[PDB]
């Protein structure tokens, strides 16, 4: 007998400098009645990719989707494929579903900062993403917050300190219609407009004296100005040489004009 999916279209998304076989998500095609879904073999049906890439993989008895490709300078290479789940340890019947996965850069990142330790954040990240994608999908049904990395709060000397009482949370939702990565400013504005409604909700999750603080910009956005180089001073020295020598030659022209003029006079 075939399994029963939770969502008929599971929804994924990864990043550019993500490593090989990173955690995309875990799937669950449930058994219908008996709950004997440990005999399920989650497998794939994958459309062909250039150069023979397998690209997106999954395990068998965990359902955890992993990656089989690198992303040197690739961007928004959105991939749709099929996933199956075979009953009877890979012998019974099956149902199939599809997954979209996007590949995001540093510029498709906005940090959520709250006033809690980050290990509690990564502990309760399931319910955190659950409450987010509960109160965000009223924008668009088809949005799914994809957590990138959960660090301590970057601040200080060129954003190189860590606050442990606070946290960094790197997220992005899903484009279900044009099916690609999402720029950081709509990532700001779709979240920031309903901030207090979810500040209500994290009291069984943050605890007490806890709330969402701010929605700020990552660190490598600042480095974009830094890698752009400019006019130095050695260059300016050579330009100053040219300006010096034309500044020398002009009075030479005028004095030799007066010279040949007085040569004509006397």
């Amino acid at each position: 007998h075939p399994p029963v999916f939770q969502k008929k279209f599971y929804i994924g998304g990864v990043s550019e400098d993500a490593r090989m076989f990173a955690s995309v998500l875990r799937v669950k095609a449930t058994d219908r009645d008996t709950g004997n879904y440990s005999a399920m073999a989650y497998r794939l049906i994958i459309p062909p990719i250039k150069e023979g890439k397998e690209g997106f993989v999954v395990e068998t008895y965990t359902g955890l989707i992993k990656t089989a490709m690198l992303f040197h300078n690739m961007r928004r290479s959105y991939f749709k494929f099929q996933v199956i789940a075979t009953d009877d340890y890979g012998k019974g019947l099956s149902g199939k579903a599809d997954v979209l996965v996007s590949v995001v850069n540093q510029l498709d990142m906005q940090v959520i900062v709250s006033n809690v330790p980050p290990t509690l954040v990564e502990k309760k990240i399931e319910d955190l993403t659950e409450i987010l994608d509960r109160y965000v999908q009223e924008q668009i049904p088809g949005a799914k917050v994809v957590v990138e990395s959960i660090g301590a709060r970057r601040h200080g000397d060129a954003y190189s300190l860590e606050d442990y009482s606070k946290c960094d949370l790197t997220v992005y939702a899903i484009d279900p219609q044009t099916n690609r990565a999402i720029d950081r400013n709509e990532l700001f504005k779709f979240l920031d407009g309903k901030l207090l409604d979810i500040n209500k909700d994290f009291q069984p999750y943050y605890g007490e004296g806890g709330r969402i603080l701010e929605i700020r910009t990552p660190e490598a956005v600042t480095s974009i100005k830094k890698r752009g180089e400019s006019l130095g001073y050695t260059e300016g020295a050579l330009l100053a040489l040219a300006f010096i020598i034309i500044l020398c030659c002009i009075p030479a022209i005028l004095v030799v004009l007066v010279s040949y003029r007085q040569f004509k006079v006397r």
Partner: protein, 164 residues
């Protein structure tokens, strides 16, 4: 006209000094790494070789150097390279017309080097006009501005060379 012949031989050896100064200036204009860049891709290309990359990428590869007469994309870049290389070899020949100063007349050699600096200013003007036709954001580097100051430089050198 004693002080005037003082001025004559003085500005003659000034031709020698300022000419070899702009010889190494134009040679520096050749063997630089920076011609025209961009900061929004993200590249610091240079029309003989070109390091082109993307955002925050560390490793860059410039494609070229000592040429094969086919390495750079635009033939307009090849032709302007030939103009400015003729300007290079011209100013080396102007060091040679400084070397031929003691044999012939001053009024001879001044007209020789005058014809030289005329052709130098003309060829540099043409190459500087050719580069934007070969060409989309840009950040222009110090090469073209050094060249456009060298324009008026060789212009003033040729004007005072016609004066002498």
């Amino acid at each position: 006209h004693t002080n005037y012949v003082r001025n004559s031989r003085a500005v003659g050896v000034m031709w020698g000094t300022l000419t070899i100064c702009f010889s190494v200036l134009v040679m520096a204009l050749f063997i630089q790494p920076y011609w025209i860049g961009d900061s929004v891709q993200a590249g610091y290309f240079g029309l003989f070789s070109y390091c082109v990359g993307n955002v925050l990428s560390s490793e860059l590869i410039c494609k070229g150097g000592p040429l094969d007469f086919s390495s750079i994309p635009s033939r307009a870049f090849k032709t302007a390279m030939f103009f400015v290389a003729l300007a290079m070899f011209l100013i080396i020949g102007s060091i040679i017309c400084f070397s031929l100063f003691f044999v012939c007349n001053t009024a001879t050699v001044y007209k020789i080097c005058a014809w030289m600096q005329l052709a130098a200013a003309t060829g540099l003007m043409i190459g500087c006009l050719v580069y934007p036709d070969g060409w989309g954001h840009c950040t222009i580097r110090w090469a073209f501005m050094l060249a456009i100051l060298s324009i008026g430089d060789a212009l003033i050198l040729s004007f005072l060379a016609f004066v002498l």
